[PDB]
């Protein structure tokens, strides 16, 4: 079986905001690394671009 010696291997906390997590980590005396949230950037979708007259976006099959 998989054995462990640390008690914090399964401890995961949920926070509403980044500031709440940072404050909780600071008041508990834990050194922390913060990663900025990754958001998928908005994209331009056009069904009519599939059947293009002169561009490469024209599809060969559908």
């Amino acid at each position: 079986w998989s054995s462990t010696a640390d008690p914090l291997s399964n401890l995961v906390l949920t926070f509403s905001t980044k500031e709440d997590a940072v404050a909780f980590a600071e008041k508990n005396g834990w050194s922390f690394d913060v990663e900025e949230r990754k958001v998928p950037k908005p994209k331009s979708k056009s069904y009519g671009a599939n059947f293009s007259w002169n561009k490469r976006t024209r599809v060969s099959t559908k």
Partner: protein, 230 residues
Amino acid sequence: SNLIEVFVDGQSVMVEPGTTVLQACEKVGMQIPRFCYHERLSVAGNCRMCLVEIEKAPKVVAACAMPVMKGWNILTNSEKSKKAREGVMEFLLANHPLDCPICDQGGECDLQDQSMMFGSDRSRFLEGKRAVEDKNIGPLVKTIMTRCIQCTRCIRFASEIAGVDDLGTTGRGNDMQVGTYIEKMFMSELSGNIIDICPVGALTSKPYAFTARPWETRKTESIDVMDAVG
């Protein structure tokens, strides 16, 4: 500027021209159900799972392909859109094989989750299901096409992202199948991504087969070192 005012469940939002109904609903915080639409691929509009009701309109529209018009009110949780979702899920599950215990994508299935969240809880399909023969496209992707829902995500990804036109649809109607029509291996430096894009267990990782379940795995975010892209 050129922003237009549209409504999602009665709440106003300003969107750029050409924005689809799905993106307008995303700007509010709702994810419309989908099977064939991918943000990275060209719009297909064939799974019909994204059908949604526009207020004062008798016919539902495909949210992934329909550009939103100024003043539209999208009823994302009306009885019409819910009934459309239930009907589409029923049609999708009519021929699907009872392979969940043996399917590698048990706890990671978009079909399973969207059936739980938007479909019914029972079936009235009393006929026999279809079965299609599997394909061999190399040692990386395992192919079980009875689970395929014909969303054509793999074909679009291969054509547009991987630059390989070896995938397509043969046949017609219910007997239309996704494949190569010949014994040919889909080998490219980006061939493994069709496993991720496939919403069902039709395409699965062959070296990963049968080894683990998603709820058991611990997720570590790291960086690739196989090349200099990182």
